[PDB]
Design an enzyme around this catalytic site. Sequence first.
Site, short mmCIF file in Angstrom:
data_model
loop_
_atom_site.label_atom_id
_atom_site.label_comp_id
_atom_site.label_asym_id
_atom_site.label_seq_id
_atom_site.Cartn_x
_atom_site.Cartn_y
_atom_site.Cartn_z
N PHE A 1 11.99 12.81 1.02
CA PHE A 1 12.26 11.37 0.97
C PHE A 1 13.69 11.06 1.40
O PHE A 1 14.62 11.78 1.04
CB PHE A 1 12.17 10.83 -0.45
N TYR B 1 13.19 3.49 0.36
CA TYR B 1 12.80 4.88 0.58
C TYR B 1 11.81 5.02 1.73
O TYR B 1 11.14 4.07 2.12
CB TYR B 1 12.18 5.49 -0.70
N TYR C 1 3.84 16.11 -7.05
CA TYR C 1 2.48 15.90 -7.54
C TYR C 1 1.72 17.18 -7.85
O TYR C 1 0.51 17.15 -8.14
CB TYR C 1 1.70 15.06 -6.54
N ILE D 1 7.80 10.45 -10.07
CA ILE D 1 7.78 11.92 -10.06
C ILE D 1 9.14 12.49 -10.47
O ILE D 1 10.18 11.87 -10.26
CB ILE D 1 7.32 12.49 -8.68
N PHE E 1 4.05 9.13 4.79
CA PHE E 1 3.03 8.51 3.96
C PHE E 1 3.40 7.14 3.40
O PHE E 1 2.52 6.42 2.92
CB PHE E 1 2.56 9.46 2.84
N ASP E 2 4.68 6.80 3.40
CA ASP E 2 5.11 5.50 2.89
C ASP E 2 6.54 5.22 3.32
O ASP E 2 7.34 6.14 3.48
CB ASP E 2 4.98 5.48 1.36
C1 LIG Z 1 1.83 0.29 -3.51
O1 LIG Z 1 2.86 1.28 -3.54
C2 LIG Z 1 3.06 1.84 -4.81
C3 LIG Z 1 3.89 3.12 -4.70
C4 LIG Z 1 3.18 4.19 -3.88
C5 LIG Z 1 2.09 4.89 -4.63
C6 LIG Z 1 1.58 6.11 -3.94
C7 LIG Z 1 2.62 6.94 -3.33
C8 LIG Z 1 2.29 8.29 -2.65
C9 LIG Z 1 3.87 6.32 -2.89
O2 LIG Z 1 3.46 5.96 -1.54
O3 LIG Z 1 4.23 5.11 -3.50
C10 LIG Z 1 4.99 7.16 -2.78
O4 LIG Z 1 5.61 7.05 -1.85
C11 LIG Z 1 5.56 7.97 -3.87
O5 LIG Z 1 5.27 9.12 -3.93
N1 LIG Z 1 6.43 7.39 -4.82
C12 LIG Z 1 6.84 5.97 -4.84
C13 LIG Z 1 8.34 5.88 -4.97
C14 LIG Z 1 8.81 6.65 -6.13
C15 LIG Z 1 8.40 8.10 -6.02
C16 LIG Z 1 6.91 8.28 -5.87
C17 LIG Z 1 6.26 8.00 -7.18
O6 LIG Z 1 6.59 8.55 -8.20
O7 LIG Z 1 5.22 7.09 -7.21
C18 LIG Z 1 4.57 6.87 -8.46
C19 LIG Z 1 3.30 7.75 -8.57
C20 LIG Z 1 2.27 7.37 -7.51
C21 LIG Z 1 2.61 7.73 -9.96
C22 LIG Z 1 3.47 8.17 -11.17
C23 LIG Z 1 4.12 9.52 -10.97
C24 LIG Z 1 4.89 9.93 -12.24
C25 LIG Z 1 3.98 9.99 -13.45
O8 LIG Z 1 4.73 10.28 -14.63
C26 LIG Z 1 3.37 8.65 -13.61
O9 LIG Z 1 2.48 8.79 -14.71
C27 LIG Z 1 2.60 7.74 -15.62
C28 LIG Z 1 2.58 8.21 -12.39
C29 LIG Z 1 4.25 5.37 -8.57
C30 LIG Z 1 5.44 4.55 -8.97
O10 LIG Z 1 6.54 4.85 -8.61
C31 LIG Z 1 5.33 3.42 -9.86
C32 LIG Z 1 6.25 2.28 -9.73
C33 LIG Z 1 4.90 3.70 -11.27
C34 LIG Z 1 3.59 3.55 -11.89
C35 LIG Z 1 2.34 3.50 -11.08
C36 LIG Z 1 3.52 4.26 -13.21
O11 LIG Z 1 4.72 4.81 -13.68
C37 LIG Z 1 3.24 3.31 -14.30
O12 LIG Z 1 2.61 3.83 -15.38
C38 LIG Z 1 1.23 4.17 -15.35
C39 LIG Z 1 4.25 2.30 -14.65
O13 LIG Z 1 4.71 2.39 -15.76
C40 LIG Z 1 4.80 1.19 -13.85
C41 LIG Z 1 6.26 1.13 -13.62
C42 LIG Z 1 4.05 -0.12 -14.00
C43 LIG Z 1 4.18 -1.14 -12.87
C44 LIG Z 1 3.57 -2.46 -13.35
C45 LIG Z 1 3.49 -0.61 -11.67
C46 LIG Z 1 4.12 -0.68 -10.46
C47 LIG Z 1 3.45 -0.05 -9.28
C48 LIG Z 1 4.04 0.02 -8.06
C49 LIG Z 1 3.37 0.95 -7.12
C50 LIG Z 1 3.66 0.78 -5.68
C51 LIG Z 1 5.02 0.30 -5.32
#
Ligand SMILES: CO[C@H]1C[C@@H]2CC[C@@H](C)[C@@](O)(O2)C(=O)C(=O)N2CCCC[C@H]2C(=O)O[C@H]([C@H](C)C[C@@H]2CC[C@@H](O)[C@H](OC)C2)CC(=O)[C@H](C)/C=C(\C)[C@@H](O)[C@@H](OC)C(=O)[C@H](C)C[C@H](C)/C=C/C=C/C=C/1C
Length: 122
Positions: free
Chosen positions: A112, A38, A95, A69, A49-50
Amino acid sequence: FEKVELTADGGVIKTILKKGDEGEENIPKKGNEVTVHYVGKLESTGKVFDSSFDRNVPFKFHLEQGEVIKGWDICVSSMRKNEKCLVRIESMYGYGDEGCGESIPGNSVLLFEIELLSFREL
Ligand SMILES: CO[C@H]1C[C@@H]2CC[C@@H](C)[C@@](O)(O2)C(=O)C(=O)N2CCCC[C@H]2C(=O)O[C@H]([C@H](C)C[C@@H]2CC[C@@H](O)[C@H](OC)C2)CC(=O)[C@H](C)/C=C(\C)[C@@H](O)[C@@H](OC)C(=O)[C@H](C)C[C@H](C)/C=C/C=C/C=C/1C
Protein backbone atom coordinates in the site's frame (compact mmCIF):
# COMPACT_ATOMS: atom_id res chain seq x y z
CA PHE A 1 14.74 6.61 1.16
CA GLU A 2 14.02 6.30 4.88
CA LYS A 3 13.21 2.54 5.07
CA VAL A 4 12.35 0.66 8.31
CA GLU A 5 11.02 -2.60 9.79
CA LEU A 6 7.96 -2.05 11.96
CA THR A 7 7.77 -5.68 13.11
CA ALA A 8 10.77 -7.75 14.16
CA ASP A 9 10.08 -10.50 11.58
CA GLY A 10 10.07 -8.09 8.62
CA GLY A 11 6.34 -8.71 8.16
CA VAL A 12 5.67 -4.98 8.00
CA ILE A 13 8.24 -2.85 6.19
CA LYS A 14 7.76 0.86 5.47
CA THR A 15 9.60 3.03 2.92
CA ILE A 16 9.08 6.79 3.30
CA LEU A 17 8.29 8.36 -0.08
CA LYS A 18 7.76 11.87 1.33
CA LYS A 19 8.72 12.89 4.87
CA GLY A 20 6.03 14.49 7.02
CA ASP A 21 6.39 16.50 10.20
CA GLU A 22 9.54 14.83 11.54
CA GLY A 23 10.75 18.01 13.25
CA GLU A 24 7.97 17.80 15.83
CA GLU A 25 7.03 14.14 15.32
CA ASN A 26 3.31 14.94 14.86
CA ILE A 27 2.08 11.37 15.15
CA PRO A 28 -1.49 10.07 15.72
CA LYS A 29 -2.37 8.06 18.82
CA LYS A 30 -4.55 5.04 19.55
CA GLY A 31 -8.25 5.85 19.28
CA ASN A 32 -7.72 8.91 17.09
CA GLU A 33 -9.71 9.01 13.91
CA VAL A 34 -7.18 9.26 11.11
CA THR A 35 -7.81 10.49 7.54
CA VAL A 36 -5.65 9.04 4.78
CA HIS A 37 -5.42 8.38 1.10
CA TYR A 38 -4.23 4.96 -0.05
CA VAL A 39 -3.67 2.63 -2.97
CA GLY A 40 -3.37 -1.11 -2.46
CA LYS A 41 -1.90 -3.73 -4.77
CA LEU A 42 -0.95 -7.40 -4.67
CA GLU A 43 2.80 -8.03 -4.66
CA SER A 44 2.31 -11.37 -6.49
CA THR A 45 0.43 -10.24 -9.61
CA GLY A 46 0.85 -6.48 -9.24
CA LYS A 47 -2.93 -6.03 -9.40
CA VAL A 48 -4.21 -2.78 -7.90
CA PHE A 49 -7.30 -3.77 -5.91
CA ASP A 50 -8.28 -0.35 -4.53
CA SER A 51 -7.35 3.33 -4.64
CA SER A 52 -8.93 6.12 -2.59
CA PHE A 53 -6.80 8.51 -4.70
CA ASP A 54 -8.70 7.42 -7.87
CA ARG A 55 -12.04 7.58 -5.97
CA ASN A 56 -10.88 10.99 -4.69
CA VAL A 57 -12.50 10.11 -1.36
CA PRO A 58 -10.21 10.16 1.69
CA PHE A 59 -10.47 7.16 4.03
CA LYS A 60 -11.16 7.44 7.78
CA PHE A 61 -10.64 4.89 10.56
CA HIS A 62 -9.81 4.78 14.26
CA LEU A 63 -6.17 3.95 14.89
CA GLU A 64 -5.23 0.82 16.81
CA GLN A 65 -8.80 -0.37 17.42
CA GLY A 66 -8.66 -3.39 15.05
CA GLU A 67 -10.89 -1.66 12.49
CA VAL A 68 -8.26 -2.38 9.85
CA ILE A 69 -5.72 -5.10 9.13
CA LYS A 70 -2.91 -5.24 11.70
CA GLY A 71 -0.20 -4.07 9.31
CA TRP A 72 -2.15 -0.84 8.78
CA ASP A 73 -2.52 -0.16 12.52
CA ILE A 74 1.22 -0.76 12.87
CA CYS A 75 2.07 1.34 9.83
CA VAL A 76 -0.11 4.34 10.53
CA SER A 77 1.02 4.41 14.21
CA SER A 78 4.51 5.15 12.91
CA MET A 79 3.57 7.90 10.43
CA ARG A 80 4.02 11.64 10.90
CA LYS A 81 1.34 14.03 9.67
CA ASN A 82 1.73 14.54 5.88
CA GLU A 83 4.00 11.51 5.44
CA LYS A 84 3.59 9.44 2.28
CA CYS A 85 4.85 5.88 2.59
CA LEU A 86 4.99 2.58 0.81
CA VAL A 87 4.28 -0.31 3.19
CA ARG A 88 4.76 -4.03 2.50
CA ILE A 89 2.45 -6.20 4.63
CA GLU A 90 2.98 -9.96 4.73
CA SER A 91 -0.11 -12.15 4.89
CA MET A 92 0.10 -12.67 8.69
CA TYR A 93 -0.47 -8.88 9.12
CA GLY A 94 -3.03 -8.70 6.29
CA TYR A 95 -5.80 -11.18 5.49
CA GLY A 96 -3.90 -14.37 6.25
CA ASP A 97 -5.02 -17.70 4.82
CA GLU A 98 -8.64 -16.53 4.29
CA GLY A 99 -7.83 -13.57 2.04
CA CYS A 100 -10.53 -10.98 1.36
CA GLY A 101 -13.33 -11.77 -1.07
CA GLU A 102 -12.69 -11.97 -4.81
CA SER A 103 -9.87 -9.38 -4.86
CA ILE A 104 -7.33 -10.73 -2.35
CA PRO A 105 -6.35 -14.38 -2.31
CA GLY A 106 -5.05 -16.28 0.70
CA ASN A 107 -1.37 -15.88 1.58
CA SER A 108 -1.12 -12.49 -0.13
CA VAL A 109 1.62 -9.94 0.48
CA LEU A 110 0.07 -6.50 0.12
CA LEU A 111 1.69 -3.27 -0.96
CA PHE A 112 0.00 0.00 0.00
CA GLU A 113 0.85 3.64 -0.47
CA ILE A 114 -0.58 5.59 2.45
CA GLU A 115 -0.70 9.39 2.82
CA LEU A 116 -1.56 10.67 6.31
CA LEU A 117 -3.63 13.83 5.86
CA SER A 118 -5.14 14.59 9.26
CA PHE A 119 -6.18 13.11 12.61
CA ARG A 120 -8.59 14.04 15.37
CA GLU A 121 -10.05 13.03 18.71
CA LEU A 122 -13.48 13.60 20.32
C1 LIG B 1 -15.87 0.19 0.06
O1 LIG B 1 -14.51 0.19 0.49
C2 LIG B 1 -14.34 -0.28 1.80
C3 LIG B 1 -12.87 -0.62 2.07
C4 LIG B 1 -12.38 -1.74 1.17
C5 LIG B 1 -12.83 -3.10 1.61
C6 LIG B 1 -12.14 -4.21 0.91
C7 LIG B 1 -10.70 -4.01 0.73
C8 LIG B 1 -9.80 -5.11 0.10
C9 LIG B 1 -10.17 -2.65 0.63
O2 LIG B 1 -10.31 -2.47 -0.80
O3 LIG B 1 -10.94 -1.63 1.22
C10 LIG B 1 -8.81 -2.48 0.95
O4 LIG B 1 -8.21 -1.83 0.25
C11 LIG B 1 -8.18 -2.83 2.23
O5 LIG B 1 -7.60 -3.87 2.31
N1 LIG B 1 -8.27 -1.98 3.35
C12 LIG B 1 -8.97 -0.68 3.36
C13 LIG B 1 -8.08 0.39 3.94
C14 LIG B 1 -7.56 -0.03 5.25
C15 LIG B 1 -6.80 -1.32 5.15
C16 LIG B 1 -7.63 -2.44 4.57
C17 LIG B 1 -8.63 -2.88 5.59
O6 LIG B 1 -8.31 -3.21 6.71
O7 LIG B 1 -9.95 -2.94 5.21
C18 LIG B 1 -10.89 -3.41 6.18
C19 LIG B 1 -11.16 -4.93 5.97
C20 LIG B 1 -11.81 -5.19 4.62
C21 LIG B 1 -12.02 -5.59 7.08
C22 LIG B 1 -11.49 -5.51 8.53
C23 LIG B 1 -10.07 -6.00 8.66
C24 LIG B 1 -9.62 -5.96 10.13
C25 LIG B 1 -10.53 -6.81 11.01
O8 LIG B 1 -10.17 -6.69 12.38
C26 LIG B 1 -11.91 -6.29 10.86
O9 LIG B 1 -12.71 -7.16 11.63
C27 LIG B 1 -13.62 -6.46 12.44
C28 LIG B 1 -12.40 -6.33 9.41
C29 LIG B 1 -12.17 -2.57 6.05
C30 LIG B 1 -12.05 -1.24 6.72
O10 LIG B 1 -11.01 -0.65 6.74
C31 LIG B 1 -13.16 -0.64 7.42
C32 LIG B 1 -13.30 0.83 7.48
C33 LIG B 1 -13.64 -1.34 8.66
C34 LIG B 1 -14.81 -2.21 8.83
C35 LIG B 1 -15.44 -2.90 7.67
C36 LIG B 1 -14.73 -2.97 10.13
O11 LIG B 1 -13.67 -2.62 10.99
C37 LIG B 1 -15.88 -2.64 10.98
O12 LIG B 1 -16.24 -3.61 11.87
C38 LIG B 1 -16.92 -4.79 11.44
C39 LIG B 1 -16.00 -1.28 11.53
O13 LIG B 1 -15.94 -1.20 12.74
C40 LIG B 1 -16.17 0.00 10.85
C41 LIG B 1 -15.18 1.07 11.07
C42 LIG B 1 -17.62 0.41 10.64
C43 LIG B 1 -17.92 1.41 9.52
C44 LIG B 1 -19.37 1.87 9.67
C45 LIG B 1 -17.67 0.74 8.22
C46 LIG B 1 -16.96 1.40 7.25
C47 LIG B 1 -16.64 0.67 5.99
C48 LIG B 1 -15.85 1.21 5.02
C49 LIG B 1 -15.40 0.22 4.00
C50 LIG B 1 -14.92 0.76 2.72
C51 LIG B 1 -14.24 2.08 2.75
